[PDB]
Amino acid sequence: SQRSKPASENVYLKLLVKLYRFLARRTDSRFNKAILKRLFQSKTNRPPISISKIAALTSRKSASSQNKTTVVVGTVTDDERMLTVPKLSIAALRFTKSARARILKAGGEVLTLDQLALRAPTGSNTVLVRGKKHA
Amino acid sequence: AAARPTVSIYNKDGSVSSETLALPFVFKAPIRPDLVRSVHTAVAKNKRQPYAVSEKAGHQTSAESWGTGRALARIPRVGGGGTHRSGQAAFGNMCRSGRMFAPTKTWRKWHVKVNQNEKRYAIASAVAASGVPSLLLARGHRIEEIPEVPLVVDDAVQSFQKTKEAVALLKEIKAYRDVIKVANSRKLRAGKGKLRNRRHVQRRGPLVVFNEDTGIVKAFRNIPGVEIVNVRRLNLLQLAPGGHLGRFVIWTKSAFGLLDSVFGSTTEVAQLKKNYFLPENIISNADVTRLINSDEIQSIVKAAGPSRVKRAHVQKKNPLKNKAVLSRLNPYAKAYKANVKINSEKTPKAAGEKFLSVLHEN
Amino acid sequence: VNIIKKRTKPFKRHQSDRFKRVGESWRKPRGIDSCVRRRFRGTISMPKIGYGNNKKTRYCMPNGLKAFLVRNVSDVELLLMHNKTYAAEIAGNVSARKRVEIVEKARALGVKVTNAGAKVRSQE
Amino acid sequence: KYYPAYRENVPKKARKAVRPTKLRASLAPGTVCILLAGRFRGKRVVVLSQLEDTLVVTGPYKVNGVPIRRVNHRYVIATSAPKIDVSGVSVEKFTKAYFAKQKRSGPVKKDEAFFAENAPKNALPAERIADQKAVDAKLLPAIKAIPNMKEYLAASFALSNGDRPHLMKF
Amino acid sequence: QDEVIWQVVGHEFCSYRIKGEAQNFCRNEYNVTGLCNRQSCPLANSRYATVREDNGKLYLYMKTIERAHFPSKLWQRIKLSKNYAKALEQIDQQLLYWPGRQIHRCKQRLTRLTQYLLKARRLALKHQPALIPIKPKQAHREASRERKA
RNA sequence: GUACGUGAAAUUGCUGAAAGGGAAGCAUUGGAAAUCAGUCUUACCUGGGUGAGAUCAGUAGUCUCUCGAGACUAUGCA
RNA sequence: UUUCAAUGGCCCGUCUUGAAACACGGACCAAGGAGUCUAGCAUCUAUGCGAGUGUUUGGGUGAUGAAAACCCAUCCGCGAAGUGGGAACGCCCUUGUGGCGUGCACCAUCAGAGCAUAGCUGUUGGGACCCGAAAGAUGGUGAACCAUCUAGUAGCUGGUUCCUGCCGAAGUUUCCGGAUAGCAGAAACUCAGAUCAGUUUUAUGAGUAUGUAAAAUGAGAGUU
RNA sequence: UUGAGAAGCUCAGACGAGUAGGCAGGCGUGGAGGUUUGUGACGAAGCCUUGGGCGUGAGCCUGGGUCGAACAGCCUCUAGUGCAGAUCUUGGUGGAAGUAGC
RNA sequence: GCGAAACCACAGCCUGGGGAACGGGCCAGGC
RNA sequence: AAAACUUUCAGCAACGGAUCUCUUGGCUCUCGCAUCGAUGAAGAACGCAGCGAAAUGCGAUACGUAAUGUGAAUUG
Structure with missing residues (x-):
């Protein structure tokens, strides 16, 4: 369920695996190889990452997030506890309806994994992130 | 992400009108x-009716186990006499x-049960599939001459009263090729299904979707294959028959204008x-x-290796x-x-003589 | 290109010739103390993947063609481009009214028919 | 009808060039050799010339009646009998086409021989006999010069009891 | 569109597919090869060209992505000359800057459709015995009545 | 043919062929006998003659799409 | 296909047993004939939405079957309640080499992930894979007989139905019917610049061997 | 060079016992939705056959005979779905046997 | 003349050896 | 060694009733309704059908009478 193809029957997920299969072997990037591997992963192994974690991780310590795209192979949920949302650019498999509205109205943009492949085909200036699996 | 902006509305005589409707987001x-x-x-x-056997079948008779070691299977055998049931086994799957x-x-x-949101997803995805002519053809619809x-x-179709009025419209928009397909496909069902009020089988015709009824249902229901439904209660059993996407659907102008309120948009909530x-x-x-074949991606990919590669060393040749092959391996x-x-x-x-003496000893 | 068959004899079920109640269709011997399962000397052979035939020549008739079941004229027209690889085989339930029209159509298409002379006579 | 309708996998370029056949050392022209197979099995004949693969061989017509014929070099035993003078007879006319079977042709129209079967017959032309009459003319004096050669070629070779082909020398 | 259409039709269900053991075939009339592939699917290929025969004349059929939602006007048709050399050039001119695989498959179909028409004309000239069906009821009737006779 | 649609297997009778020193028995390889699939040259290339006709006209019309693309009609067959 | 010749070929299943010996079951054929349905629980996968989630007790509605589909008022259930190594990235610049930063998940050192449905698997109840053990009790009929509870009770007996392919034991340490472990797989992790071995050495010691420490040879290894 | 069912095509090397058990892909049956503009009185299904073919196999296709009214391939759904055994159940039928015997 | 039933994997010469019985099947000998 | 007898194969004839096809039957679910008896019920018996195999119907007015409806049958 994780090795050579996703167990998912979603046709559009198969189209993303097809796109990053090409990017993984025709480029010498470990980002395309890492993204392709995480597309085979199951829902349990792709935890959601909150909109607050993205804001915290980008503006952490020295911050200076500049405009690097935050990439997660998973769902970007919303954190209603945080009140001010920074200007963020996140590419994810799925955004919730509240998270997408909060990101857009509070400055920045939301992307899909195929919109980012056209902006950063080698994944340059990308902040690859993950959700905590402790659950 | 880029699709046709508007759709044309056709009249009763199959002629295009100047009016157009923006394509709904569904x-x-x-x-x-x-x-x-x-x-x-x-x-x-x-919509499945229950079935089950009687709560006493196979146990109505009376029997007891004659015993163990009596040169016969220890299954209980019906008691009494005068009837051939004497010694016949029951209370078991193998016994008659x-x-x-x-x-x-x-x-x-x-x-x-299905989550109501999955059901709305499927019906939305099945309505989208009905706007793709390739999916209609692959599901068995004869839409090759549909305009x-x-x-x-037009909405004047909603007030048809006679079937021959409906048949004229289907012939004007070349949608009768699908009805003729359904009429020709009517066969006697195979199996025991035809002993059980499932006598005949046939294909599915167009699905006519209206907004308000003024005779459209009565004028279309007797055409073999055509199903008429209201835009407010779209049915996945009728939008993806057999689970197959791409049903041939005919809309009235009012039904198509109410698709935006039934389904909404990906950003705006549905009204209904x-x-x-x-x-x-x-x-x-x-x-x-x-x-994959874009300028953004193809500009950074490394030079593609060949397609199916040539076989080097099909057969091993001995240099000796x-x-x-020896001249190739050794340029010497x-x-x-x-x-x-x-x-x-x-x-x-x-x-020397010293060596000879030692050798020539004993 | 010649078709090579690793085996031509079928694999019969063990002890199928001693009993009428036991059919010839191959059944794997589940007995542990069975000589056929342990593959002694003189015991019959069993279906193994080693007997599998060449992929290129698999499903090929001795004449080099692959059978294609045909129920009407529309089926035989599909073999317009594949007449050197496939042979038309009219189904057993196709009537003689349609068998003649399939054979005449398959003649112009240059398609071999495996059972073209069935349920019909000739009249020169 | 000409653009290839199928995949038409062209054969890969083979590397099998045709080089001349190397005949045996003892299969020289003018050698008296025994035919091993065919309708003239056992007959002793004289080798005129070596073709590309076979031997253009003939027994004298008046001696054993073996016309000018091709014989495969594997189907011949080359005896060590004294050689015959063959440099005096031209053998350029003995080519592959000279012995080649006449092309099966004839635009026979429907019926008559096509149906009624009034077929024609074959016959050796006098041209073949004319060339043949020359070779025995240039060969008979050669075989008559040495003793027993005329009687040798007339006889037919055979194996008697207690004859071991591997041991006894030809 | 095309990649979504192919996933739905090529892998879930197409009414045109004949599932054979060695290969899948296509019942579509607009398929050049007659096989079920990604490249030969007329439904999943928005730009598609094929050759088919109408009453003895071969036509080049072409469709573009921009006519995909007008089924009556989807396919355009031109006449291919009886001269083979001119017919090949007609496909080359009409299919200019199309992929070489699509022109290759259209010229291959033109050869097979030309041979079939040639073979159809030669069969008409020849005298071939007419195949007459064997009727199971009449055979049984005549066999029984013969025994009585 | 009311021993009644279809009419399997076990089993029985007759007929034919073959085999047969106290088993059959199956497998592997062939022989013999019987019996089958199992097929063919018929087309290509190149003419020339003769006429034929359109997708050919130093041609005229109609219809459906959209100039030219298909369907036909009349005439010529250079 | 039949038959002949040469060579080979102990009767199948069950139980037993290292193995067999066994003892069982098998006159023959046809048809029937055994892991099912359902409630709960847990893992895993898929799907929907996501700090939420679940329409179907019910109401609204549904003219072409209206037991479907479609819609949702109020509740309620379940959830919410600094330093190192490191994925990935940018910048170099002797450029590879490395260095300089930013450092997810997770592990070492001092910024909620659920809920619902479906399937798989395991498990516990119901008759619970099928056939199997004297009954007992209630109520009747003339100690006996009959009907029902009953599908009563089974650790045990016999049986348990298609094919192919790939993995593949153990048959026992240890505590003590067991909890471990071992053996065999699955998943997630970190690593080939790292470690490992029914290995052989070298030498230190200790008493021809011994253990330990550090050269050859082979294999990428360690985990949870 | 056309060889993109990217679920395809292609190149290379190694390997092949197997009980309990683990895993994967397939064959077949009854019924259901879809489909094949499917097959059928010019003969459906079934059965018979020393006819032919396909598959490693489960099985499948087909000729001939018999027969007489229905039936199948493909995608999906579903289950009272596959037998040689249970001193299995029901039915039929044998050797013992024209025997014991009356 | 009328007429069963038990039983029924299949069989049916010995001699030895064949370790587990092995003789009724296996191996070497006779028939 | 041929016959007989035995065995094997095939043909035909028996035996048997499988399979296939269906079917005025069962089973299951849902919906509407409320109607036995001393004014003799349920049940049992005995009779009547020109004959009815039974079975059904009926009660000495006996496979029914009166009345109404359809309008020409009954039937082996």
Whole structure:
């Protein structure tokens, strides 16, 4: 369920695996190889990452997030506890309806994994992130 | 992500009108054959009548075990006499007139639940599939002469009263090729199904979707194959028959204008469904060929290796027998001089008397 | 290109010739103390994947063609481009009214028919 | 009808060039050799010339009646009998086409011989006999010069009891 | 569109597919090869060209992505000359800057459709015995009545 | 043909062929006998003659789409 | 296909047993004939939405079957309640080499992930894979007989139905019917610049061997 | 060079016992939705056959005979779905046997 | 003349050896 | 060694009733309704059908009478 193809029957997920299969072997990037591997992963192994974690991780310590795209192979949920949302650019498999509205109205943009492949085909200036699996 | 902006509305005489309708956002929803056929599988089970055997079948008789060691199987045999039942076994699956193993019960789960949001997703994805002519053809519809897909007709169709009025419209928009297909396909069903009020089978014709009824249902219901439905209660059993996407659907102008309120948009809530938004897609543009073969991506890929590669070394050749392979492996065999004369005319016998004495001992 | 068959004899069920109640169709011997399962000397052979035939020549008739079941004229027209690889085989339930029209159509298409002379006579 | 309708996998370029056949050392022209197979099995004949693969061989017509014929070099035993003078007879006319079977042709129209079967017959032309009459003219004096040669070629070779082909020398 | 259409039709269900053991075939009339592939699917290929025969004349059929939602006007048709050399050039001119695989498959179909028409004309000239069906009821009737006779 | 649609297997009778020193028995390889699939030259290339006709006209019309693309009609067959 | 010749070929299943010996079951053929349905629980996968989630007790509605589909008022259930190594990235610049930063998940050192449905698997109840053990009790009929509870009770007996392919034991340490472990797989992790071995050495010691420490040879290894 | 069912095509090397058990892909049966503009009185299904073919196999296709009204391939759904055994159940039928015997 | 039933994997010469009985099947000998 | 007898194969004839096809039957679910008896019920018996195999119908007015409806049958 994780090795050579996703167990998912979603046709559009198969189209993303097809796109990053090409990017993984025709480029010498470990980002395309890492993204392709995480597309085979199951829902349990792709935890959601909150909109607050993205804001915290980008503006952490020295911050200076500049405009690097935050990439997660998973769902970007919303954190209603945080009140001010920074200007963020996140590419994810799925955004919730509240998270997408909060990101857009509070400055920045939301992307899909195929919109980012056209902006950063080698994944340059990308902040690859993950959700905590402790659950 | 780029689709046709508007659709044309056709009149009763099959002629185009100057009016047009913006394409509703439901036709831009993701098309999910996995999700449509999973929801269809559950919904198709929701009108099943229970069946079960009698609660006493195979146990109506009276029998007892004659015993163990009496040169016969220890299954109980019916008592009494005068009838051939004497000695015949029951209360068991193998025995004739016995209890069949695990008798069927009426409280088997006949119906199955689906989340209401998955159901709305499937119906949205099945409506989107009905705007793709290729999906209509692959599902068995004879739409090769239909003027346009989606096929929208005037609202005057909603007040047809006679079937011959409906047949004239289907012939004017070339939609009768599908009805003729359904009429020709009517066969007697195979199997025991025709002993059980399932006498005949046939194909599915166009699905006519109206807004308000003024005779459209009565004028279309007798045409073999055509199903008439209201835009407010669209049915996945009728939008993906058999779980297959791409039903040929004919809309009236009023039904097509009410699709935006029934389904809403991916950002704006549906008017007729409280707190419902159209599903979003994992990919914005679903043409993977366009992304892969794009200038953005093809400019940074390394030079592609060949396609199916040539077979180097199909057969192993021995250099010690094939002189040509030896010449390739060793660029020195051409000048070797294997036999070189060393001892020409000297050959001095080198064995002193001390060595000879030791050798010639005992 | 010649078709090579690793085996031509079928694999019969063990002890199928001693009993009428036991059919010839191959059944794997589940007995542990069975000599056929342990593959002694003189015991019959069993279906193994080693007997599998060449992929290129698999499903090929001895004449080099692959059978294609045909129920009407529309089926035989599909073999317009594949007449050197496939042979038309009219189904057993197709009537003689349609068998003649399939054979005449398959003649112009240059398609071999495996059972073209069935349920019909000739009249020169 | 000409653009290839199928995949038409062209054969890969083979590397099998045709080089001349190397005949045996003892299969020289003018050698008296025994035919091993055919309708003239056992007959002793005289080798005129070596073709590309076969031997253009003939027994004298008046001696054993073996016309100018091709014989495969594997189907011949080359005896060590004294050689015959063959440099005096031209053998350029003995080519592959000279012995080649006449092309099966004839635009026979429907019926008559096509149906009624009034077929024609074959016959050796006098041209073949004319060339043949020359070779025995240039060969008979050669075989008559040495003793027993005329009687040798007339006889037919055979194996008697207690004859071991591997041991006894030809 | 095309990659979504192919996933739905090429892998879930197409009414045109004949599932054979060695290969899948296509019942579509607009398929050049007659096989079920990604490249030869007329439904999943928005730009598609094929050659088919109408009453003895071969035509080049072409469709573009921009006519995909007008089924009556989807396919355009031109006449291919009886001269083979001119017919090949007609496909080359009409299919200019199309992929070389699509022109290759259209010229291959033109050769097979030309041979079939040639073979159809030669069969008409020849005298071939007419195949007459064997009627199971009449055979049984005549066999029984013969025994009585 | 009311021993009644279809009419399997076990089993029985007759007929034919073959085999047969106290088993059959199956497998592997062939022989013999019987019996089958199992097929063919018929087309290509190049003419020339003769006439034929359109997708050819130093041609005229109509219809459906959209100039030119298909369907036909009349005339010529250079 | 039949038959002949040469060579080979102990009757199948069950139980037993290292193995067999066994003892069982098998006159023959046809048809029937055994892990089912359902409630709960847990893992895993898929799907929907996501700090939420679940329409179907019910109401609204559904003219072409109206037991379907479609819609949702109020509740309620379940959830919410600094330093190192490191994925990935940018910048170099002797450029590879490395260095300089930013450092997810997770592990070492001092910024909620659920809920619902479906399937798989395991498990516990119901008759619970099928056939199997004297009954007992209630009520009747003339100690006996009959009907029902009953599908009563089974650790035990016999049986348990298609094919192919790939993995593949153990048959026992240890505590003590067991909890471990071992053996065999699955998943997630970190690593080939790292470790490992029914290995052989070297030498230190200790008493021809011994253990330990550090050269050859082979294999990418360690985990949870 | 056309060889993109990217679920395809292609190249290379190694390897092949197997009980309990683990895993994967397939064959077949009854019924259901879809489909094949499917097959059928010019003969459906079934059965018979020393006819032919396909598959490693489960099985499948087909000729001939018999027969007389229905039936199948593909995608999906579903289950009372596959037998040589249970001193299995029901039915039929044998050797013992024209025997014991009456 | 009328007429069963038990039983029924299949069989049916010995001699030895064949370790587990092995003789009724296996191996070497006779028939 | 041929016959007989035995065995094997095939043909035909028996035996048997499988399979296939269906079917005025069962089973299950849902919906509407409320109607036995001293004014003799349920049940049992005995009779009547020109004959009815039974079975059904009926009660000495006996496979029914009166009345109404359809309008020409009954039937082996």
